[PDB]
């Protein structure tokens, strides 16, 4: 027979009837075609098993995955990789739009840090995209009163009332007259992409001396952070300056192309997480080279 799956995107919900033998590719190619999304390499189908994310493997049967099989079997369509330059790599309208929504939520949920002034400018493009051009006779004072435009973090940094925020965002909003939906969403993305925590996947690790650290895996390379500073890495390894990443048991080794440069090894305990890290290393490395 068939089994029903529910597919969750950033703004919609879909439901598909899958033959029992369907691999990830069957389901994934179908979702992308339905969306008219052509830059498929950025995206994947996500589910979460015991507080660790996992991605649908293409060459694997949907039901051989350890996703909860209680109907409907649910997957979240999300970007797994991020482009180095959004304006140039995101061509389809739906693609730009789903990145916009995935990134905006990261910011409002404070998963991606952004300075107060960046959050105000980002909000103004967000409202421009949703409400179109400004018109003071239609969008009367108080029309953004219940709209969620800023991270709670920035409003707890200022002696400012909500009306003061709304007044400030509206002024910047008015500055974007003439900008179409897609244009405002792309502008939002251009600002967001320069943020330090943008597009980076963080994993807690330990160096051989036993010191607890963070691994950052993003489009440009591997990064090592002190756990209290996710903004600025202590060490970076660009993808082109890396010879190989080997994995064994719970130990990673980063081997630089420059043989005189010491090797960097670290441990991670959870093996589900280590599999994820490798996919993210492999995929990001591939896209990095193919762009060059």
């Amino acid at each position: 027979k068939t089994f029903t799956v529910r597919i969750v995107t950033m703004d919609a919900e879909m439901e598909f009837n899958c033959e029992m033998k369907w691999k990830g590719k069957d389901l994934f190619d179908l979702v992308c075609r339905t969306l008219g999304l052509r830059e498929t390499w950025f995206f994947g189908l996500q589910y979460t098993i015991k507080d660790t994310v996992a991605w649908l493997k293409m060459d694997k049967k949907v039901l051989d995955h350890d996703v909860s099989k209680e109907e409907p079997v649910t997957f979240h369509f999300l970007a797994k990789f991020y482009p180095e330059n959004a304006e140039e790599e995101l061509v389809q309208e739906i693609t730009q739009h789903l990145f916009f929504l995935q990134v905006k939520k990261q910011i409002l949920d404070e998963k991606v840090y952004c300075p107060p002034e960046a959050s105000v400018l980002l909000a103004s493009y967000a409202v421009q995209a949703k409400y179109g051009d400004y018109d003071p006779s239609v969008h009367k004072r108080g029309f953004l009163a219940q709209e969620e435009l800023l991270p709670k973090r920035v409003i707890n940094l200022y002696q400012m009332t909500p009306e003061m925020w709304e007044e400030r965002i509206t002024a910047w909003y008015a500055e974007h007259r003439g900008r179409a939906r897609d244009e405002a969403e792309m502008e939002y993305l251009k600002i967001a992409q320069d943020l330090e925590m943008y597009g980076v996947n963080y994993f807690t690790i330990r160096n051989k001396k036993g010191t607890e650290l963070l691994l950052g895996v993003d489009a440009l390379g591997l990064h090592i952070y002190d756990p209290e500073n996710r903004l600025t890495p202590k060490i970076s390894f660009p993808w082109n300056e890396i010879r190989n990443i080997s994995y064994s048991d719970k130990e990673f080794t980063i081997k630089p192309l420059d043989k005189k440069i010491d090797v960097f090894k670290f441990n991670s305990s959870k093996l589900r997480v280590n599999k994820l890290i490798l996919q993210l290393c492999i995929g990001n490395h591939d896209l990095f080279m193919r762009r060059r």
């Binding site: 107060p116 002034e117 960046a118 400018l121 200022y158 002696q159 910047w172 500055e175 251009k190 600002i191």
Partner: peptide
């Protein structure tokens, strides 16, 4: 774009907000 650039706008926004803390 009357604010010129994003690089300028971010600074305009930061300094006009700076009097609150």
């Amino acid at each position: 774009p009357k604010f010129g650039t994003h690089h300028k706008a971010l600074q305009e926004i930061r300094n006009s907000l700076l009097p609150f803390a």
